């Protein structure tokens, strides 16, 4: 066999230990999920520093007057939310964020509402998105890409144990904190589902073929997306791209991918097993589950526990200015709370 008794027993015990962590993690999640927290701050607790983004609402850098600590506050206009048919998405996203707990998931620190708006007060990550670092550097070396990939593998293993499908993996949704580690943001398309689901959602370059083909699909779409992400991090561009989304979908369902000549054989083997159209052969979807991914040769040097514990030295630390340096400043359009409670019943649960 590939490993003798010492290696095989240590691996077995580590895998059993993961099961024990997940079982406890699921119990903590379900309590918060069945009994969500509400109204844990108010607007006048914060000073609006800078509008960091602007459809359904804006995201503003704010400063807690009491704490002094900075936060990223998502302001959602309740009427705009209702008019654009986003009630369930917004409720679900906040309910997931308040219930999950994992070191690579951006944290909801406060939530509340007033007559006009819904507010989600998140951890502020001044390093910004992986997207811009990746486009700036060009591509990440395989060890650098692997350090990020390991965190996503663990995060998906966590999320899938809770029957959550993430469905919007991409560098735009991965923030880099001040220790160089990944924070996943934007659970707007995440769904708690045990079996199949059918919604056409995601980003074109990251869509699994079974989504494109109008099939019912499951959590295996996140493992396909992991493959696109690893490819893009190590190549500098995604495996499937074209002028128009339709031509991207053609390449995705074709079952063909080409790799740069600088990809190691270990990497190409992993990516062929993730970017696998056949669901009965896609890593993450087989009898051994996530272990086929964790035990793959490309991850041989990965110390999964040390990554989870954040003991591994990051390959890259964004310039520690919090400064809005890594964000394109917008017109600070003020926030006004109507004298009348708008859309009370629709957002009772928020």
């Amino acid at each position: 066999g590939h490993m003798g008794n010492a290696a095989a027993a240590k691996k077995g015990s580590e895998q059993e230990s993961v099961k024990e962590f997940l079982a406890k993690a699921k119990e903590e999640f379900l309590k918060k999920w069945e009994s969500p927290s509400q109204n844990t701050a108010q607007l006048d607790h914060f000073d609006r520093i800078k509008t960091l983004g602007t459809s359904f609402g804006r995201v503003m850098l704010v400063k807690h007057k009491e704490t002094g600590n900075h936060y990223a506050m998502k302001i959602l206009d309740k009427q705009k939310v209702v008019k654009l048919k986003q009630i369930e998405h917004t409720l679900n996203e906040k309910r997931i964020l308040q219930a999950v707990n994992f070191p690579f998931l951006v944290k909801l620190e406060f939530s509340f509402k007033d007559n006009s708006n819904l507010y989600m007060v998140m951890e502020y990550v001044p390093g910004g998105e992986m997207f811009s670092h990746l486009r700036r550097i060009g591509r990440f070396s395989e060890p650098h890409a692997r350090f990020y990939a390991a965190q996503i593998v663990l995060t998906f293993e966590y999320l899938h144990s809770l029957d959550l499908i993430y469905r919007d993996l991409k560098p735009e949704n991965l923030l880099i904190d001040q220790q160089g580690y990944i924070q996943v943001t934007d659970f707007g398309f995440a769904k708690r589902v045990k079996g199949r689901t059918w919604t056409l959602c995601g980003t074109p370059e990251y869509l699994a073929p079974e989504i494109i083909l109008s099939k019912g699909y499951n959590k295996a779409v996140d493992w396909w997306a992991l493959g696109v992400l690893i490819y893009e991090m190590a190549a500098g561009y995604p495996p499937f791209f074209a002028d128009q989304p339709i031509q991207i979908y053609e390449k995705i369902v074709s079952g063909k991918v080409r790799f740069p000549s600088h990809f190691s054989s270990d990497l190409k083997d992993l990516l062929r097993n993730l970017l696998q159209v056949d669901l009965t052969k896609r890593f993450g979807n087989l009898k051994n589950g996530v272990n086929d991914i964790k035990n793959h040769k490309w991850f041989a040097t990965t110390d999964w526990i040390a990554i989870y514990q954040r003991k591994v030295e990051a390959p890259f630390i964004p310039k520690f200015k919090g400064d809005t340096s890594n964000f394109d400043d917008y017109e600070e359009e003020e926030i006004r709370v109507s004298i009348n409670e708008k859309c009370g019943k629709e957002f009772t649960e928020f």
């Binding site: 486009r135 919007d168 735009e172 980003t203 190549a235 561009y237 791209f241 074209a242 002028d243």
Partner: peptide, 18 residues
């Protein structure tokens, strides 16, 4: 090159969902 093709795609910027 593939890289040039990526540039030619017009999809080098931040990509929206849906």
């Amino acid at each position: 090159t593939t890289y040039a093709d990526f540039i030619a795609s017009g999809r080098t910027g931040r990509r929206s969902a849906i």
